[PDB]
Amino acid sequence: GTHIDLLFHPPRAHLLTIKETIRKMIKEARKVIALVMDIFTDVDIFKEIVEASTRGVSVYILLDESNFNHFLNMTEKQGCSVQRLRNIRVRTVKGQDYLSKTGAKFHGKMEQKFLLVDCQKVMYGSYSYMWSFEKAHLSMVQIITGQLVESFDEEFRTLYARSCVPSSF
Amino acid sequence: GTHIDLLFHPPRAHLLTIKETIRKMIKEARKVIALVMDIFTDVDIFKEIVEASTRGVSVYILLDESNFNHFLNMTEKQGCSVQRLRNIRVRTVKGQDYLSKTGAKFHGKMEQKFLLVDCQKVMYGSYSYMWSFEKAHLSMVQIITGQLVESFDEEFRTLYARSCVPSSF
Numbered sequence: 001g002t003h004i005d006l007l008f009h010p011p012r013a014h015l016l017t018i019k020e021t022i023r024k025m026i027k028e029a030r031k032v033i034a035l036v037m038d039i040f041t042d043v044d045i046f047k048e049i050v051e052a053s054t055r056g057v058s059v060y061i062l063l064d065e066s067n068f069n070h071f072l073n074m075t076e077k078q079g080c081s082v083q084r085l086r087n088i089r090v091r092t093v094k095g096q097d098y099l100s101k102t103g104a105k106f107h108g109k110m111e112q113k114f115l116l117v118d119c120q121k122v123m124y125g126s127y128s129y130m131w132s133f134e135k136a137h138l139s140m141v142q143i144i145t146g147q148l149v150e151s152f153d154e155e156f157r158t159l160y161a162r163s164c165v166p167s168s169f
Numbered sequence: 170g171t172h173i174d175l176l177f178h179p180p181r182a183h184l185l186t187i188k189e190t191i192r193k194m195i196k197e198a199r200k201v202i203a204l205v206m207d208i209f210t211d212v213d214i215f216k217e218i219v220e221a222s223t224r225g226v227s228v229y230i231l232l233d234e235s236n237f238n239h240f241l242n243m244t245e246k247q248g249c250s251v252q253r254l255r256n257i258r259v260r261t262v263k264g265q266d267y268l269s270k271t272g273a274k275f276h277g278k279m280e281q282k283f284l285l286v287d288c289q290k291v292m293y294g295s296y297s298y299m300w301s302f303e304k305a306h307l308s309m310v311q312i313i314t315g316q317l318v319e320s321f322d323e324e325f326r327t328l329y330a331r332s333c334v335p336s337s338f
């Protein structure tokens with residue numbers, strides 16, 4: 001009782017692109033959108049999320065900490081003050097703490113990406129929400145429904161508990 | 170008829186780490202190993218692969234073209250001329266051709282990471298075979314059996330047809 005379809009970019013034998021499928025999933029949202037992403041600079045996908053929040057959908061976004069200022073800079077160039085949108089909460093996640101060869105203290109990255117809508121459908125895979133994934137790279141995603149979606153819901157809650165308010169805010 | 174389990178790094182409730190489960194998957198190979206990977210510098214996983222080859226398992230490895238020299242540098246430090254192992258074939262895959270605003274043509278990257286053993290079991294996810302995924306980063310994989318494995322076999326064959334002999338070789 002889990003069903004899975006594969007999609008690719010550039011696209012193969014499927015009618016929609018990965019980016020067009022992400023837009024559809026967000027337009028179809030009725031209650032909640034949960035997103036985990038490493039880099040998010042795509043203006044078209046951002047515009048779909050803001051529209052959903054204006055309809056009354058609760059939006060929770062978890063971003064890799066090292067790359068967060070790329071997202072904030074895009075939203076400001078769009079004229080948007082994302083801080084002011086009450087139906088959206090944006091928080092950052094760090095990787096492990098570690099010591100380098102020279103003894104300095106750094107943290108790694110959250111290498112995770114997925115989109116979870118209404119606790120019933122997930123898109124999971126290697127596509128990041130930036131221009132390079134449209135024009136330069138090969139990538140793939142799964143569209144997932146059924147019992148496995150509950151395991152993504154539990155992982156989202158665990159990451160939300162770990163996450164912090166962004167330091168730039 | 171597809172079963173999927175999740176594993177994390179750092180580990181959550183499961184006994185084995187992601188790296189221990191990769192080693193297990195390789196040791197259990199009877200006929201064929203098929204690997205697609207973006208960066209491969211982990212000496213311990215490479216030793217498992219070479220040992221499988223010596224017992225007569227056929228090994229096919231597809232690496233991101235722009236990161237190939239990191240693999241070659243590792244195999245040379247270990248004192249192994251990998252190009253002399255007849256049961257291993259290593260080939261590279263490029264991203265899309267694109268033209269920058271200064272006119273120069275470039276290519277992007279293959280962002281895809283999976284291990285397929287005996288056409289029957291896959292590990293798919295965000296874990297790359299390098300020291301930073303052990304010590305620094307947060308990552309996750311799926312362990313997949315059943316009908317979905319066929320779709321990973323088809324994608325492997327399609328990348329294998331695209332791939333080239335590395336230019337050093």
Ligand SMILES: C[C@H](O)CNCc1ccc2c(c1)OCO2
Nearest residue numbers: 027044046047048049050051052
């Ligand atoms: C005013 C009306 O009620 C809603 N406007 C439709 C609409 C406009 C812009 C959009 C969108 C949808 O999705 C992404 O950007």
Ligand SMILES: C[C@H](O)CNCc1ccc2c(c1)OCO2
Nearest residue numbers: 196213215216217218219220221
């Ligand atoms: C009997 C002979 O030495 C080979 N089998 C033992 C063994 C040695 C080295 C290995 C390994 C297994 O797996 C990975 O590295």
